[PDB]
Design an enzyme around this catalytic site. Structure first.
Site, PDB file in Angstrom:
ATOM      1  N   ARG A 133       0.838  -1.193   0.000  1.00 36.51           N
ATOM      2  CA  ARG A 133       0.000   0.000   0.000  1.00 36.51           C
ATOM      3  C   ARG A 133       0.875   1.247   0.000  1.00 36.51           C
ATOM      4  NH1 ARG A 133      -2.049   1.312   4.264  1.00 36.51           N
ATOM      5  NH2 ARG A 133      -1.262  -0.361   5.631  1.00 36.51           N
TER       6      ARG A 133
ATOM      7  N   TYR B 113      -1.064  -4.748  -6.227  1.00 40.74           N
ATOM      8  CA  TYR B 113      -0.736  -5.354  -4.948  1.00 40.74           C
ATOM      9  C   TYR B 113      -1.890  -5.277  -3.963  1.00 40.74           C
ATOM     10  CZ  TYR B 113       2.305  -7.292  -1.449  1.00 40.74           C
ATOM     11  OH  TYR B 113       2.925  -8.173  -0.590  1.00 40.74           O
ATOM     12  N   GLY B 114      -2.186  -6.421  -3.347  1.00 39.51           N
ATOM     13  CA  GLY B 114      -2.999  -6.554  -2.152  1.00 39.51           C
ATOM     14  C   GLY B 114      -3.977  -5.453  -1.805  1.00 39.51           C
TER      15      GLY B 114
ATOM     16  N   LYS C 241      -9.254  -3.266   2.319  1.00 44.61           N
ATOM     17  CA  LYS C 241      -9.165  -2.074   3.161  1.00 44.61           C
ATOM     18  C   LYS C 241     -10.053  -0.959   2.633  1.00 44.61           C
ATOM     19  CE  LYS C 241      -5.771  -3.497   5.959  1.00 44.61           C
ATOM     20  NZ  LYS C 241      -6.042  -3.740   7.377  1.00 44.61           N
TER      21      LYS C 241
ATOM     22  N   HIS D 236     -10.447  -1.861  12.594  1.00 40.19           N
ATOM     23  CA  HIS D 236      -9.255  -2.639  12.290  1.00 40.19           C
ATOM     24  C   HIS D 236      -8.974  -3.567  13.473  1.00 40.19           C
ATOM     25  CE1 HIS D 236      -4.786  -2.601  10.873  1.00 40.19           C
ATOM     26  NE2 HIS D 236      -5.450  -3.640  10.396  1.00 40.19           N
TER      27      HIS D 236
ATOM     28  N   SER E 172      -0.596  -2.534  12.119  1.00 38.78           N
ATOM     29  CA  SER E 172       0.103  -3.554  11.357  1.00 38.78           C
ATOM     30  C   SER E 172       1.420  -3.896  12.045  1.00 38.78           C
ATOM     31  CB  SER E 172       0.347  -3.068   9.926  1.00 38.78           C
ATOM     32  OG  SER E 172       1.074  -4.033   9.185  1.00 38.78           O
ATOM     33  N   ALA E 173       1.753  -5.189  12.048  1.00 34.40           N
ATOM     34  CA  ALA E 173       2.990  -5.731  12.614  1.00 34.40           C
ATOM     35  C   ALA E 173       3.046  -5.627  14.133  1.00 34.40           C
ATOM     36  CB  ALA E 173       4.240  -5.070  12.009  1.00 34.40           C
ATOM     37  N   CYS E 174       1.900  -5.528  14.807  1.00 36.60           N
ATOM     38  CA  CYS E 174       1.882  -5.559  16.265  1.00 36.60           C
ATOM     39  C   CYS E 174       1.132  -6.760  16.822  1.00 36.60           C
ATOM     40  CB  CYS E 174       1.296  -4.260  16.825  1.00 36.60           C
ATOM     41  SG  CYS E 174       2.258  -2.832  16.309  1.00 36.60           S
ATOM     42  N   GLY E 175       0.807  -7.736  15.989  1.00 31.81           N
ATOM     43  CA  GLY E 175       0.454  -9.059  16.452  1.00 31.81           C
ATOM     44  C   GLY E 175      -1.007  -9.469  16.409  1.00 31.81           C
ATOM     45  N   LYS E 176      -1.829  -8.850  15.563  1.00 32.84           N
ATOM     46  CA  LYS E 176      -3.235  -9.249  15.500  1.00 32.84           C
ATOM     47  C   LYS E 176      -3.374 -10.716  15.109  1.00 32.84           C
ATOM     48  CE  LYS E 176      -4.966  -6.150  12.736  1.00 32.84           C
ATOM     49  NZ  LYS E 176      -3.562  -5.614  12.601  1.00 32.84           N
TER      50      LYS E 176
ATOM     51  N   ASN F 234      -1.205 -13.227  15.268  1.00 28.73           N
ATOM     52  CA  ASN F 234      -0.723 -14.117  16.323  1.00 28.73           C
ATOM     53  C   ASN F 234      -1.754 -14.292  17.424  1.00 28.73           C
ATOM     54  OD1 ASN F 234       2.282 -15.174  16.450  1.00 28.73           O
ATOM     55  ND2 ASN F 234       2.288 -13.268  15.264  1.00 28.73           N
TER      56      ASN F 234
ATOM     57  N   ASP G  59      -8.377  -9.383  11.134  1.00 29.97           N
ATOM     58  CA  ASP G  59      -8.060  -8.066  10.597  1.00 29.97           C
ATOM     59  C   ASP G  59      -9.203  -7.056  10.666  1.00 29.97           C
ATOM     60  OD1 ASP G  59      -5.860  -6.577   9.402  1.00 29.97           O
ATOM     61  OD2 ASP G  59      -7.200  -6.279   7.712  1.00 29.97           O
TER      62      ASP G  59
ATOM     63  N   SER H  96       5.756  -9.204   2.300  1.00 30.62           N
ATOM     64  CA  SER H  96       5.274 -10.350   1.548  1.00 30.62           C
ATOM     65  C   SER H  96       4.124 -11.023   2.296  1.00 30.62           C
ATOM     66  CB  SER H  96       6.416 -11.332   1.272  1.00 30.62           C
ATOM     67  OG  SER H  96       6.943 -11.865   2.470  1.00 30.62           O
ATOM     68  N   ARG H  97       3.279 -11.733   1.547  1.00 28.57           N
ATOM     69  CA  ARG H  97       1.966 -12.134   2.037  1.00 28.57           C
ATOM     70  C   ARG H  97       1.673 -13.593   1.754  1.00 28.57           C
ATOM     71  NH1 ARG H  97      -0.868  -8.235   5.117  1.00 28.57           N
ATOM     72  NH2 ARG H  97       0.331  -6.323   4.672  1.00 28.57           N
TER      73      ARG H  97
ATOM     74  N   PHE I 234       3.367 -14.164  22.758  1.00 27.87           N
ATOM     75  CA  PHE I 234       2.822 -15.267  21.949  1.00 27.87           C
ATOM     76  C   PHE I 234       1.811 -16.032  22.805  1.00 27.87           C
ATOM     77  CE2 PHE I 234       6.986 -14.149  20.175  1.00 27.87           C
ATOM     78  CZ  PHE I 234       6.580 -13.792  18.903  1.00 27.87           C
TER      79      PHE I 234
ATOM     80  N   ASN J 210       0.429 -14.915  26.101  1.00 25.69           N
ATOM     81  CA  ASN J 210      -0.564 -13.861  26.236  1.00 25.69           C
ATOM     82  C   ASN J 210      -1.916 -14.393  26.675  1.00 25.69           C
ATOM     83  OD1 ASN J 210       1.316 -11.944  25.467  1.00 25.69           O
ATOM     84  ND2 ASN J 210       0.850 -12.243  23.290  1.00 25.69           N
TER      85      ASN J 210
HETATM   86  N1  LIG Z   1       7.586 -10.108  21.154  1.00 23.62           N
HETATM   87  C1  LIG Z   1       6.374 -10.428  20.622  1.00 23.62           C
HETATM   88  N2  LIG Z   1       6.240 -10.352  19.276  1.00 23.62           N
HETATM   89  C2  LIG Z   1       5.071 -10.659  18.678  1.00 23.62           C
HETATM   90  C3  LIG Z   1       3.922 -11.076  19.491  1.00 23.62           C
HETATM   91  N3  LIG Z   1       2.892 -11.326  18.654  1.00 23.62           N
HETATM   92  C4  LIG Z   1       3.354 -11.085  17.407  1.00 23.62           C
HETATM   93  N4  LIG Z   1       4.645 -10.672  17.431  1.00 23.62           N
HETATM   94  C5  LIG Z   1       5.465 -10.349  16.244  1.00 23.62           C
HETATM   95  O1  LIG Z   1       4.852  -9.296  15.515  1.00 23.62           O
HETATM   96  C6  LIG Z   1       5.081  -9.504  14.121  1.00 23.62           C
HETATM   97  C7  LIG Z   1       3.793  -9.282  13.353  1.00 23.62           C
HETATM   98  O2  LIG Z   1       2.810 -10.169  13.868  1.00 23.62           O
HETATM   99  P1  LIG Z   1       1.419 -10.278  13.085  1.00 23.62           P
HETATM  100  O3  LIG Z   1       0.597 -11.290  13.836  1.00 23.62           O
HETATM  101  O4  LIG Z   1       1.672 -10.360  11.593  1.00 23.62           O
HETATM  102  O5  LIG Z   1       0.827  -8.808  13.355  1.00 23.62           O
HETATM  103  P2  LIG Z   1      -0.329  -8.164  12.431  1.00 23.62           P
HETATM  104  O6  LIG Z   1       0.551  -7.745  11.287  1.00 23.62           O
HETATM  105  O7  LIG Z   1      -0.930  -7.073  13.303  1.00 23.62           O
HETATM  106  O8  LIG Z   1      -1.268  -9.306  12.166  1.00 23.62           O
HETATM  107  C8  LIG Z   1       5.516 -10.943  13.930  1.00 23.62           C
HETATM  108  O9  LIG Z   1       6.867 -10.974  13.486  1.00 23.62           O
HETATM  109  C9  LIG Z   1       5.471 -11.553  15.303  1.00 23.62           C
HETATM  110  O10 LIG Z   1       6.601 -12.415  15.456  1.00 23.62           O
HETATM  111  C10 LIG Z   1       4.134 -11.136  20.939  1.00 23.62           C
HETATM  112  O11 LIG Z   1       3.181 -11.491  21.659  1.00 23.62           O
HETATM  113  N5  LIG Z   1       5.350 -10.800  21.428  1.00 23.62           N
HETATM  114 MN   LIG Z   2      -2.288  -9.705  10.142  1.00 24.76          MN
END
Ligand SMILES: Nc1nc2c(ncn2[C@@H]2O[C@H](COP(=O)(O)OP(=O)(O)O)[C@@H](O)[C@H]2O)c(=O)[nH]1
Ligand SMILES: [Mn+2]
Ligand SMILES: [Mn+2]
Ligand code: NA
Length: 612
Positions: free
Chosen positions: A85, A233-234, A242, A262, A284-288, A290, A309, A402-403, A520, A523
């Site tokens: 994006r 792209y996506g 989105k 979101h 984004s990249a904060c763990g949704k 996971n 998401d 990458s996706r 992970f 949590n």
């Molecule tokens: N230290 C830590 N890192 C995490 C945790 N959950 C996710 N991450 C990292 O955050 C990155 C993005 O996670 P992702 O689930 O793709 O987040 P999204 O992009 O919001 O869905 C990944 O590299 C995970 O390894 C956590 O509970 N602790």
């Molecule tokens: Mn995600």
């Protein structure tokens, strides 16, 4: 009618029939067929035969490769200029700029990008005329949400990209059944072109049509239109992902009284057989993903995934906040996904999955930074830039954005109600981001208004701590101040069962840069505390920023010595600066549209900090 032969495109229809379309859908198809001048029109039916043939066709064009280690998995490698994006080319069109962004007091708005109607008309005329020449125009009828859900909305995407058709089939509910359900109803108009009419004027790179210099992703909420040009792209091209799900939908939700957010949605069951549903907004990249697919470490606990998401949420007549996942698949960032971090995602993506810009192994598998899986000796890796690659080489084998794009029904812990048209009742909303310092592992908001303030003040590490209110900063479909007012107005609905609002930080770090919390699956211990709080357990200690867990309220058994005092430390010095920074941000960015109740929560927090 016609005085010649140029307005009726029935002779160019290679699948389906323009007569079988609802009247307004036909006019949308034919009008843009006349503008874009496609060679062919393909009305998608969504069948597995259509999908298998599209895939094989893309395989023979070199557009995708088949990943032979897995069952019906595919790999696309893009033009490196078209990999993500682009916020700066993403715009919303309204008569008045103030309907789209608050007018900042001093700075440029970070909360959206407005473009006048006049400017967009010029941009549109400079892009779309003739842009599909020599290409097929695919017509994608798709439903956002379970077909026939009161929360579902229907879209029609026109695209010249078969990659988009295949990815939309995974990410939405797509095909003939949608047309039948739509009938004469309203729909969102989705127009997408990669912007490379044939014959090609510019080099095609990596068999990936794009037009980066004219890329523009536009949203016209008053016309119910999304118009996106130049990117394949996506998020630029899957207009449900989105553009529809968050930008158009948030405007529609404001008008109709619901919420488009979101947020992941998960279902959690405790050892006494009670099940609650939670939504969580992380940037984004904060763990949704996971959290939504978590494998909990606490015995007897279970987590099930409704979505990872997007949530659409509406208070029903009984006052329950009912949420649906309007998507049909997961479009997850691949790098960092490992069996250790997300084993349930690993199981999900081994079948029926399209990967984009990851690395490929010599035996037909996928690879990416953070996969944490050893390759057998002899196995070699091709990078996402189609070159040989070695672990010690100093550039990623997979693009960082990458996706994988995989069907949600394949997730081994998909929730049994994930397609219920009624949605699931949300009892808890979690905010959070990456904060290396100062923010405790978890705290609970003091009230709905404080909770809305907590979402509004969200910040997150990019060496920069950025503001990302509600995790929606790139995605607001309208004035953020009115969005805050919309959230606050939920408290004034009679019967409304306002969920508890929490804020988490998985990412607090000690003075050596080490994560204080293992995260992970661990949590699930924080989720346990939230579960008890929703039930009314007396497990909370009041602090200036909200409630935190009592000493020994968290289950830390099976963990080492976690440093709890630093993980939950609250420093007057940090929070003085935090509240100062929030103040300047809200005054600058929201300015005259900042709700009174938010300004009040800010004053209150400042005052609680000043007394500690
Ligand atoms: N230290 C830590 N890192 C995490 C945790 N959950 C996710 N991450 C990292 O955050 C990155 C993005 O996670 P992702 O689930 O793709 O987040 P999204 O992009 O919001 O869905 C990944 O590299 C995970 O390894 C956590 O509970 N602790
Ligand atoms: Mn995600
Ligand atoms: Mn109020
Ligand atoms: Na390619």
């Amino acid at each position: 009618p016609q005085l010649h032969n140029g307005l009726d495109f029935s002779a160019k229809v290679i699948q389906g029939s323009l007569d079988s379309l609802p009247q307004e859908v036909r006019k949308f198809v034919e009008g843009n067929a006349q503008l874009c001048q496609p060679e062919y029109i393909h009305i998608c039916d969504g069948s597995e035969e259509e999908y298998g043939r599209l895939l094989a066709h893309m395989q023979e064009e070199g557009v995708i490769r088949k990943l032979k280690k897995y069952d019906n998995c595919w790999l696309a490698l893009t033009d490196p200029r078209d990999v993500a994006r682009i916020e700066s080319k993403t715009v919303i069109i309204t008569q008045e700029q103030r309907d789209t962004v608050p007018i900042p007091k001093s700075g440029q708005s970070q909360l959206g990008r407005w473009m006048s109607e006049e400017d967009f008309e010029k941009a549109f005329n400079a892009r779309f005329p003739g842009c599909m020449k020599g290409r097929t125009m695919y017509v994608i009828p798709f439903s956002m949400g379970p077909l026939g859900s009161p929360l579902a909305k229907i879209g029609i995407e026109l695209t010249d990209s078969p990659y988009v058709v295949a990815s939309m089939r995974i990410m939405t509910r797509m095909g003939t059944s949608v047309l039948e359900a739509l009938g004469d109803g309203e729909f969102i108009k989705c127009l997408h072109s990669v912007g490379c009419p044939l014959p090609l004027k510019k080099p095609l790179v990596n068999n990936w049509a794009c037009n980066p210099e004219l890329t523009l992703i536009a949203h016209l909420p008053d016309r119910r239109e999304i118009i996106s040009f130049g990117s394949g792209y996506g998020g630029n091209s899957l207009l449900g992902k989105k553009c529809f799900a968050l930008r158009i939908a948030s405007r529609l939700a404001k008008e109709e009284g619901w919420l488009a957010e979101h947020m992941l949605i998960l279902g959690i069951t405790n050892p006494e057989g009670k099940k609650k549903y939670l939504a969580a907004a992380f940037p984004s990249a904060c763990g949704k993903t996971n959290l939504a697919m978590m494998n909990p470490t606490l015995p007897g606990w279970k987590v099930e995934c409704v979505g990872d998401d997007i949530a659409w949420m509406k208070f029903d007549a009984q006052g329950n906040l009912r949420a649906i996942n309007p998507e049909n698949g997961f479009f997850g960032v691949a790098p960092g996904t490992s069996v250790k971090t997300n084993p349930n995602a690993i199981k999900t993506i081994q079948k029926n999955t399209i990967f984009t810009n990851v690395a490929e192994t010599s035996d037909g598998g996928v690879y990416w930074e953070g996969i944490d899986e050893p390759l057998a000796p002899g196995v070699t890796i091709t990078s996402w830039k189609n070159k040989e690659w070695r672990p010690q080489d100093e550039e990623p084998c997979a693009h960082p954005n990458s996706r994988f794009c995989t069907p949600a029904s394949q997730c081994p812990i998909i929730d049994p109600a994930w397609e219920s048209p009624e949605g699931v009742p949300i009892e808890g909303i979690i905010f959070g981001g990456r904060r290396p310092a100062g923010v405790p592992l978890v705290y609970e908001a003091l009230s709905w208004q404080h909770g809305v303030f907590v979402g509004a003040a969200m910040r997150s590490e990019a060496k920069v701590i950025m503001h990302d209110p509600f995790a929606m900063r790139p995605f607001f479909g309208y004035n953020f101040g009115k969005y805050l007012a919309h959230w606050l107005s939920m408290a004034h609905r009679p019967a409304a069962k306002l969920p508890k609002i929490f804020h988490v930080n998985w990412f607090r770090k000690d003075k050596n840069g080490k994560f204080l919390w293992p995260g992970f699956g661990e949590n699930s211990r924080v989720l346990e505390w939230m579960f008890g709080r929703i039930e009314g357990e007396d497990s909370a200690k009041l602090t200036p920023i909200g409630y935190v867990p009592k000493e020994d309220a968290l289950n830390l058994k099976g963990l080492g010595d976690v440093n709890v005092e630093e993980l939950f430390g609250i420093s007057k010095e940090f929070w003085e600066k935090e509240v100062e920074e929030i103040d300047k941000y809200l005054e600058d960015q929201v300015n005259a549209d900042l709700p009174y109740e938010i300004e009040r929560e800010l004053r209150a927090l400042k005052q609680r900090i000043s007394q500690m």
